[PDB]
């Protein structure tokens, strides 16, 4: 009766979606073939797979997501790898020529020829499900497909389905390192679409994942194949209350109203804790207070900002595991006592909790330990304006010499969108400072 649909865009999206769906296989016990194991001859244990996996009369479970990318090379590893029989032959959309780190190639010239093919399967996955909350978007700012094609996908989806929910997990550019050069162009020019054609948008920074995975899990030199496990661990704790039973359930509609106070303010921030190794797990006791303190600690913060310099507007607790509600209230009443953490004076109740019973599972070869309880943050704070300020300063000095303009003008779009995208943000940063100003 409940279903969820995920749309993963770009090379970032198709690579985090592989680790996202292998965990979904392991929570419901789905083998890479696509069924219950043949050792178990009677099944249908609980209809928690109905929201993530389809049902066929032969006993096969098919996922309810779609993968889109303009690069065929990273897509066909799913066709070649272990999970070839599990994923549908149609649910993985393949391009022919990549956008090549550009916005106009992904938007106006190549994004048009495949925007109708995906929408057919989006409609096909929409009438399968009786009840749909909305769509999850796993896209990247720096990618050509994740910027250009997404800036037409969210626009067309908003008129394809009016009041449907729209959640985004965006791979935000890191403030120090980057794999490209023209990523401020790819980041700014897609913000004009996403500020009006999205409901909620969590940001993920890779270099903050780099330090967190290094200093906490005691694993030096990580790889993307384990970062996507961490991001895939975040996605399961959000949708845990939908699938699994809990003391009180949080919907996909519950936190989209409790983290977005203004239509121009829809940028929360994610944080996961505890993140410890197997060797560190058994020495340290893991209390509810000791896992909620690291969440509010800016050292464990997953986007490279500081709430000490900023101020929160809203937060969201995702408690999953062996947790009782008594010390949850003792923890959050203790959080309200420290004056180092500062809230705004107009949102005196900034808490929403969600309780799930089943502790998180672990994967063979993964980095995280077998843990009994965990908590995920979805907090909205104004410290992102610190990150936006240093992103536009780089954008303004890069545009002052009119570099890389010929890569965009000759593709078909006009040069007036460059000035508008800089100005529309400048009003948005003015909106960011005005909500932070108290009475």
């Amino acid at each position: 009766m409940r279903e969820c649909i995920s749309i993963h865009v770009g090379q970032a999206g198709v690579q985090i979606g592989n680790a996202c769906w292998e965990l979904y296989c392991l929570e419901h016990g789905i083998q890479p073939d696509g069924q219950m194991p043949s050792d178990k001859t009677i099944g249908g244990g609980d209809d928690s797979f109905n929201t993530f996996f389809s049902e066929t009369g032969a006993g096969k479970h098919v996922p309810r997501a779609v993968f889109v990318d303009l690069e065929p090379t990273v897509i066909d590893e799913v066709r070649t790898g272990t999970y070839r029989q599990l994923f549908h032959p149609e649910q993985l959309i393949t391009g022919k020529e990549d956008a090549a780190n550009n916005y106009a190639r992904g938007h106006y010239t190549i994004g048009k020829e495949i925007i109708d093919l995906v929408l057919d399967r989006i409609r096909k996955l929409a009438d399968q499900c009786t009840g749909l909350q909305g769509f999850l978007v796993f896209h990247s700012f720096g990618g050509g497909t994740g910027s250009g094609f997404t800036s037409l996908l969210m626009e067309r989806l908003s008129v394809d389905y009016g009041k449907k929910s729209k959640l985004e997990f965006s791979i935000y550019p890191a403030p120090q390192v980057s794999t490209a050069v023209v990523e401020p162009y790819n980041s700014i020019l897609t913000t004009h679409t996403t500020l009006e054609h999205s409901d909620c948008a969590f940001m993920v920074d890779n270099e903050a994942i780099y330090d967190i995975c290094r200093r906490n899990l005691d694993i030096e030199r990580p790889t993307y194949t384990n970062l996507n496990r961490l991001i895939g661990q975040i996605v399961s704790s959000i949708t845990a209350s939908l699938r699994f039973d809990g003391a009180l359930n949080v919907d996909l509609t519950e936190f989209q109203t409790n983290l977005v106070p203004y239509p121009r303010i829809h940028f929360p921030l994610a944080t996961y804790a505890p993140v410890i190794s197997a060797e560190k797990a058994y020495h340290e006791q893991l209390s509810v207070a000791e896992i909620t303190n690291a969440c509010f600690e800016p050292a464990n913060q997953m986007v490279k900002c500081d709430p000490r310099h900023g101020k929160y507007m809203a937060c969201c607790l995702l408690y999953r595991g062996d947790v009782v509600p008594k010390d949850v209230n003792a923890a959050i009443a203790t959080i309200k006592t420290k004056r180092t953490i500062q809230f705004v004076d107009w949102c005196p109740t900034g808490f929403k909790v969600g309780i799930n019973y089943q502790p998180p599972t672990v994967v063979p070869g993964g980095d995280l330990a077998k843990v009994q309880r965990a908590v995920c943050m979805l907090s909205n704070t104004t410290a992102i304006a610190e990150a936006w300020a240093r992103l536009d300063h780089k954008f303004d000095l890069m545009y002052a010499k009119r570099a890389f303009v010929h890569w965009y003008v000759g593709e078909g779009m006009e040069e007036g969108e460059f000035s508008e995208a800089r100005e529309d943000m400048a009003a948005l940063e003015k909106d960011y400072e005005e909500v932070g100003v108290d009475s």
């Binding site: 050792d39 178990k40 001859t41 009677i42 249908g44 244990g45 609980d46 209809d47 039973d245 077998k370």
Partner: protein, 143 residues
């Protein structure tokens, strides 16, 4: 188990569950049917799952075509009390159905009688591999 601590200690301490048992522990699945008097509406095949972690029993009925009843789930990960009653003022800790389930044992769950009829292949492999617990799977004693 939460209120033992008032007489175990003057100041109570949180109850400590079995970390060891949760750490090593898959799911033992049995086929069951409903047993009451002769009623025509009740010919329903259920499946009972013992979880071997927190010692917990969950019963579910698969959805059957053109049936007048559609019950997706019967119990939600909750322990089962045997029909021996003695609910209040019980000095000992309460009795709970442990993991002793054969083929043909009529188990009384929540007042509903359930006859076990078949086991999954993993369950029967468990039966034959672990026999100190179950003398009914010995080939030598069977012969």
């Amino acid at each position: 188990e939460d209120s033992l601590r008032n007489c175990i200690d003057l100041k109570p301490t949180p109850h400590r569950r079995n970390f060891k048992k949760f750490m090593e522990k898959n799911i033992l699945r049995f086929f069951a049917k409903l047993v009451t008097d002769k009623c025509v509406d009740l010919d329903r095949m259920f499946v009972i799952s013992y979880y071997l972690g927190d010692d917990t029993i969950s019963v579910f009925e698969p959805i059957e075509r053109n049936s007048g009843i559609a019950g997706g789930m019967f119990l939600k990960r909750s322990r089962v009390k045997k029909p021996g009653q003695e609910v209040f003022k019980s000095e000992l800790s309460e009795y709970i159905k442990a993991e002793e389930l054969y083929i043909g044992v009529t188990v009384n769950v929540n007042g509903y009688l359930f006859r076990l009829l078949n086991a999954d292949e993993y369950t029967l492999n468990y039966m034959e591999q672990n026999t100190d617990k179950y003398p009914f799977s010995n080939l030598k004693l069977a012969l």
